[PDB]
PDB file of C-alpha atoms in Angstrom:
ATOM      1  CA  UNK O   1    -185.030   7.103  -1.535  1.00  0.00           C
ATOM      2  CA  UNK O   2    -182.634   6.772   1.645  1.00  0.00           C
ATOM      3  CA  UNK O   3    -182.495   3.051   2.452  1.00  0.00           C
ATOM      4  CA  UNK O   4    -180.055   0.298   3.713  1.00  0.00           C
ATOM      5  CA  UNK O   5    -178.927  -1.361   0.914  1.00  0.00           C
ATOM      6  CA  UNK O   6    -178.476  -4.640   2.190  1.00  0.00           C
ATOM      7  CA  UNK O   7    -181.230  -6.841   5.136  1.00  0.00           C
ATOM      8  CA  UNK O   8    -179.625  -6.593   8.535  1.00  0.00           C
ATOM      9  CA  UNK O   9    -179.924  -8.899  10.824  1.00  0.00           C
ATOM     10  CA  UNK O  10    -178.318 -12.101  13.268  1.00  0.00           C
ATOM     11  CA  UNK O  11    -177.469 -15.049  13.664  1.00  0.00           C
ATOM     12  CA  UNK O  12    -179.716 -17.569  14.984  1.00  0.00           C
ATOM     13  CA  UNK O  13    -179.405 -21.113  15.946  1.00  0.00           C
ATOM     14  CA  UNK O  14    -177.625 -23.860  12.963  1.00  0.00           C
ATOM     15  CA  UNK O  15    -176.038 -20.425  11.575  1.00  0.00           C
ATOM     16  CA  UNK O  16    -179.374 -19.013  10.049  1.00  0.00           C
ATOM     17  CA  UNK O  17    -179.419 -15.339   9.309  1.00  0.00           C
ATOM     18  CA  UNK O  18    -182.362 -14.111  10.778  1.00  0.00           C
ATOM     19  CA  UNK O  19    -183.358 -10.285   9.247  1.00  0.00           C
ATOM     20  CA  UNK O  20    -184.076  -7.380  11.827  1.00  0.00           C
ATOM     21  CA  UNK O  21    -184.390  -4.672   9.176  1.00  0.00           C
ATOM     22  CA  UNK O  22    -184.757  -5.755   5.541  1.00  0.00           C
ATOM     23  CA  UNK O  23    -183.188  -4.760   2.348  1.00  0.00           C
ATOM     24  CA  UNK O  24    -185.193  -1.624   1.177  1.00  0.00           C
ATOM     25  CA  UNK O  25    -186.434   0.009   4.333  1.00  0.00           C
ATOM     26  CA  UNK O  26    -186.531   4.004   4.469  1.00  0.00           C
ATOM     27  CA  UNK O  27    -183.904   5.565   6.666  1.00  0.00           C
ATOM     28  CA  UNK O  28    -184.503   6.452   9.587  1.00  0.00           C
ATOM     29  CA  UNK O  29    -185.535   3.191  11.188  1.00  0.00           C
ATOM     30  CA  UNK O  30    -186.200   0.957  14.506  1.00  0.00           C
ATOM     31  CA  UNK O  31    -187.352  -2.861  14.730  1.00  0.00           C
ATOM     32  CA  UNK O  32    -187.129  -5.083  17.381  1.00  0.00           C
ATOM     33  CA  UNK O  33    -188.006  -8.733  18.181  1.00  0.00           C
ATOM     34  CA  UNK O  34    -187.419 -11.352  21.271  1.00  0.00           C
ATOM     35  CA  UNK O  35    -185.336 -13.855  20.669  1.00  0.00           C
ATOM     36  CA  UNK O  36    -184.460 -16.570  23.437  1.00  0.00           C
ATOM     37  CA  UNK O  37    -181.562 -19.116  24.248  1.00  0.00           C
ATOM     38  CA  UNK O  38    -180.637 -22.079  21.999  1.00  0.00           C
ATOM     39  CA  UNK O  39    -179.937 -24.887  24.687  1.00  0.00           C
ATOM     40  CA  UNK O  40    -180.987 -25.501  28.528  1.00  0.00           C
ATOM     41  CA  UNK O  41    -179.375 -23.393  31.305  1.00  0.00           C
ATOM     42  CA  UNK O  42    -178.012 -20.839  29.020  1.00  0.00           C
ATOM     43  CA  UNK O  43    -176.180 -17.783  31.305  1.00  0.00           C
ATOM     44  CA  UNK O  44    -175.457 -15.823  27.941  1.00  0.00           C
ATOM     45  CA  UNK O  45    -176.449 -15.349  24.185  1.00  0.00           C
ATOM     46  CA  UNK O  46    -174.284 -13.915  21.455  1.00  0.00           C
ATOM     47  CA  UNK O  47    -175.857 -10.992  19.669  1.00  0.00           C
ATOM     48  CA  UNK O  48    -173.948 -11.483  16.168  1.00  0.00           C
ATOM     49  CA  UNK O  49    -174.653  -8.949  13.327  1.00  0.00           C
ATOM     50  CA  UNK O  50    -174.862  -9.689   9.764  1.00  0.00           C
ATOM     51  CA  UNK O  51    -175.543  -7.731   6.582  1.00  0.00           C
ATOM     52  CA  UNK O  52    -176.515  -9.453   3.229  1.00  0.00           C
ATOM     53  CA  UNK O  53    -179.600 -11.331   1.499  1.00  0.00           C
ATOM     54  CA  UNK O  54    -178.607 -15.042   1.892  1.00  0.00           C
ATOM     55  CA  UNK O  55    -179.978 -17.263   4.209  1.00  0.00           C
ATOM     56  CA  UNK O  56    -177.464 -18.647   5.688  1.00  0.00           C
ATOM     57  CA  UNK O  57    -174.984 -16.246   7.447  1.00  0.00           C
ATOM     58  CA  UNK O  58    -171.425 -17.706   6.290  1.00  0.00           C
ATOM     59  CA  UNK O  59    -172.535 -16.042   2.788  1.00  0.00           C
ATOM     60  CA  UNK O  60    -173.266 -12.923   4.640  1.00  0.00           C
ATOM     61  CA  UNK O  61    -170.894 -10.220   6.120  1.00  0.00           C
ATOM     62  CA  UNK O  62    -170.422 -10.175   9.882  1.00  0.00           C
ATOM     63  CA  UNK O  63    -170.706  -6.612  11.291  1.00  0.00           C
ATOM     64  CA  UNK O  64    -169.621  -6.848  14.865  1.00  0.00           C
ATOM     65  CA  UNK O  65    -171.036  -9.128  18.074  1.00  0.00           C
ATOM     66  CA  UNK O  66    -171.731  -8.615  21.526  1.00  0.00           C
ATOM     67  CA  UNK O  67    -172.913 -10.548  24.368  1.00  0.00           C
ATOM     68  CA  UNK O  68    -175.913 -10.106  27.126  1.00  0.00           C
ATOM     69  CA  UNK O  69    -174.479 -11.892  29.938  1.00  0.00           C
ATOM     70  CA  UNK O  70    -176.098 -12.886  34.123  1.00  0.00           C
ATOM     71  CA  UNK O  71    -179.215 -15.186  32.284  1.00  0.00           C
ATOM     72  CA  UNK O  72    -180.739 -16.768  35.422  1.00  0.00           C
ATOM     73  CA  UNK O  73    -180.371 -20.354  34.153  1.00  0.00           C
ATOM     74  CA  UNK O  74    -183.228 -21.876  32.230  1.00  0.00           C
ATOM     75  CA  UNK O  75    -184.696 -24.240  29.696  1.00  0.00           C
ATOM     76  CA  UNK O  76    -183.990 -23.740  25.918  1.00  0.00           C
ATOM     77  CA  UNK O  77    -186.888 -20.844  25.063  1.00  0.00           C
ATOM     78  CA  UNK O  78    -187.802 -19.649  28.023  1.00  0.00           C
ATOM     79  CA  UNK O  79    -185.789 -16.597  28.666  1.00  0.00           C
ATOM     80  CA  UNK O  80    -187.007 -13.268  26.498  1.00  0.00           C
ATOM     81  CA  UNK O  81    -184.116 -11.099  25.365  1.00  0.00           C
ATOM     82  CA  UNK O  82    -185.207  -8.237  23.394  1.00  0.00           C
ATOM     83  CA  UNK O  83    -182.770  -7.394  19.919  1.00  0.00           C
ATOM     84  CA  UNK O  84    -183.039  -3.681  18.894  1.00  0.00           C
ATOM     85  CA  UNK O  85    -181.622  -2.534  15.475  1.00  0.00           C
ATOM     86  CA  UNK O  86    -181.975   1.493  14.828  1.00  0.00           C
ATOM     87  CA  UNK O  87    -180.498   3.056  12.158  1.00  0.00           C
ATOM     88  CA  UNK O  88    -180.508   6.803  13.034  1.00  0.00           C
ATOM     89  CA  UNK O  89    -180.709   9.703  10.926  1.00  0.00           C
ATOM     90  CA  UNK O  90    -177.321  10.045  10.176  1.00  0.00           C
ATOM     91  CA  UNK O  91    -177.444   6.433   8.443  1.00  0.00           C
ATOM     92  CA  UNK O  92    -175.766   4.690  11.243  1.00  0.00           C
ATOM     93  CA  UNK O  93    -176.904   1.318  12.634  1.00  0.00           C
ATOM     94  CA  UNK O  94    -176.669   0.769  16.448  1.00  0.00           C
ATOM     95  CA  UNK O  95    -178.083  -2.833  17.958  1.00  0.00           C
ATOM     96  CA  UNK O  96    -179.112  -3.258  21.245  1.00  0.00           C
ATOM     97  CA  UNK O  97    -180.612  -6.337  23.420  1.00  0.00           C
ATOM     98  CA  UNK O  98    -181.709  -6.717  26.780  1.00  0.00           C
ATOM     99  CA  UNK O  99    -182.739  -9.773  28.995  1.00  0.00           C
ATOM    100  CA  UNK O 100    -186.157  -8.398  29.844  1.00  0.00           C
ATOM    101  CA  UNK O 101    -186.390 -10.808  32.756  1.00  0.00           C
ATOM    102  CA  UNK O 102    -182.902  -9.241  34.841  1.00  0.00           C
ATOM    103  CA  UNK O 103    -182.767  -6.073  32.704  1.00  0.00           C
ATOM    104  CA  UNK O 104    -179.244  -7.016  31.388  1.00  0.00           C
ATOM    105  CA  UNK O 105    -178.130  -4.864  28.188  1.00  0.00           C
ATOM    106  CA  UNK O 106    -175.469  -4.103  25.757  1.00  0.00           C
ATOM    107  CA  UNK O 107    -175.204  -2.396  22.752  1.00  0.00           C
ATOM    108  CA  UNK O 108    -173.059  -1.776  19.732  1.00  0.00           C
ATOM    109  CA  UNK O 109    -172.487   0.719  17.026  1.00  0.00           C
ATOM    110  CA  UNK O 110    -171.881  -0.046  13.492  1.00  0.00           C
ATOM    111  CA  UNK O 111    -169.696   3.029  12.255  1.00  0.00           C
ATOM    112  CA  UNK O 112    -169.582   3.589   8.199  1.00  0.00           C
ATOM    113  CA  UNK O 113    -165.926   4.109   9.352  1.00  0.00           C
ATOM    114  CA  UNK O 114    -164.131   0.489   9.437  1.00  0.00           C
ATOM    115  CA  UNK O 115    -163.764  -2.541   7.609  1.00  0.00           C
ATOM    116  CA  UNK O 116    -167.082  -1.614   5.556  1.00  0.00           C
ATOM    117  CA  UNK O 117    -167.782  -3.310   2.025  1.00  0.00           C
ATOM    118  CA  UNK O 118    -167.477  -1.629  -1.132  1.00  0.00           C
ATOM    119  CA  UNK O 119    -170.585  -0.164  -3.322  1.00  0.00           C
ATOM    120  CA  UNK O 120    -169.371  -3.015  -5.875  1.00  0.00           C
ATOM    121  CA  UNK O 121    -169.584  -6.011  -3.253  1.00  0.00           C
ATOM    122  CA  UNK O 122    -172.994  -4.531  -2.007  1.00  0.00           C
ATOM    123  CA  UNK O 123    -173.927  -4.890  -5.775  1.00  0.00           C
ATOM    124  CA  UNK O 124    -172.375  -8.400  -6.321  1.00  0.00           C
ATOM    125  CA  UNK O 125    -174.395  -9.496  -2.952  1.00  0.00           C
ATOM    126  CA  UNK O 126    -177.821  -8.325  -4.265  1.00  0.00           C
ATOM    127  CA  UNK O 127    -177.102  -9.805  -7.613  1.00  0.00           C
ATOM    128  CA  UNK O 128    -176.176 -12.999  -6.094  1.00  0.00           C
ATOM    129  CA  UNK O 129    -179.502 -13.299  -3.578  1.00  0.00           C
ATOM    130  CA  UNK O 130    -181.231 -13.453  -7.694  1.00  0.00           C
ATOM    131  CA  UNK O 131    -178.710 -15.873  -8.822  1.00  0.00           C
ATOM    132  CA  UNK O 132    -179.223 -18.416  -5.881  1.00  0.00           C
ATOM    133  CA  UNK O 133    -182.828 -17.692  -5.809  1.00  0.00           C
ATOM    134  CA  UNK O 134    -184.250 -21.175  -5.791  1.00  0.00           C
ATOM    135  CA  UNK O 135    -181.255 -22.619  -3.323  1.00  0.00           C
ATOM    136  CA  UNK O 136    -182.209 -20.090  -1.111  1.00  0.00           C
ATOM    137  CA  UNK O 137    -185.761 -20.001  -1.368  1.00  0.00           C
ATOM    138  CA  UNK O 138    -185.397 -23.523  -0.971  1.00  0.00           C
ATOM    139  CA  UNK O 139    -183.027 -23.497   1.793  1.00  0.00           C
ATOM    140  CA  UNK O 140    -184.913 -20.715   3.893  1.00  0.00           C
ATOM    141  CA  UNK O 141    -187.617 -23.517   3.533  1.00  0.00           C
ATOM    142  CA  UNK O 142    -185.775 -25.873   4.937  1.00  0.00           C
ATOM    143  CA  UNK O 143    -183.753 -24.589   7.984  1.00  0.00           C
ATOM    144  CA  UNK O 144    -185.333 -24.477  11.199  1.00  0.00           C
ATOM    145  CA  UNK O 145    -185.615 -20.200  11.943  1.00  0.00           C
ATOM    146  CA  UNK O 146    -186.968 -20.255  15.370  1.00  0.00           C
ATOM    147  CA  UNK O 147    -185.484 -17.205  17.134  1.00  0.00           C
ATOM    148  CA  UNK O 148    -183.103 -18.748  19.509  1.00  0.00           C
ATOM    149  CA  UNK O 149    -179.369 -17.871  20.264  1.00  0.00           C
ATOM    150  CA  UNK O 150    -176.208 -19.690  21.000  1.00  0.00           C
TER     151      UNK O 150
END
């Protein structure tokens, strides 16, 4: 089966990776969610992309970032900004988001082309989601994952 070998997703507030596609899925593929802004009288959020099965996303591998700028300003949670992530039929992965309120958008593509990791680290990453099972499991359980960006 045709899949993406490792979850895909961002960053969400205290640096928690927060999965968009995960580990597994059939190729070709779309999912979105809303996420919102981390603090009061936010203009922008940081759409930052991650690959890899850990919780946290320092022990993940950063893809690429972009930013949806003009955010009328607002308290923490209300604005909705809408995070695409489609990985087309050719395998590649392009993320998109949008302020739905203003109708603000950018997007990025994720080429197979450039600074890419290896079929051995994509092994070593999957073996190591097993081998830090419980401090993840645990961890996940403890980290606040509500869907807010800095």
């Amino acid at each position: 089966a045709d899949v993406n070998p490792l979850t895909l997703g961002i960053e969400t507030v205290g640096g928690v990776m927060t999965k968009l596609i995960g580990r597994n899925t059939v190729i070709p593929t779309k999912k979105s969610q809303v996420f919102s802004t981390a603090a009061d009288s936010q203009s922008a959020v940081s759409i930052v992309i991650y690959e890899g099965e850990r919780p946290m996303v320092m022990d993940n591998h950063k893809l690429g970032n972009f930013d949806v700028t003009g955010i009328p300003p607002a308290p923490r949670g209300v604005p909705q900004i809408e995070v695409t992530f489609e990985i087309d039929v050719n395998g590649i992965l392009h993320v998109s988001a949008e302020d739905k309120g203003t109708g603000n958008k950018n997007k990025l593509t994720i080429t197979n082309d450039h600074n890419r990791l290896s079929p051995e680290d994509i092994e070593r990453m999957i073996n190591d989601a097993d081998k830090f099972a419980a401090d993840d499991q645990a961890q996940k359980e403890k980290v606040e994952s509500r869907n807010e960006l800095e």
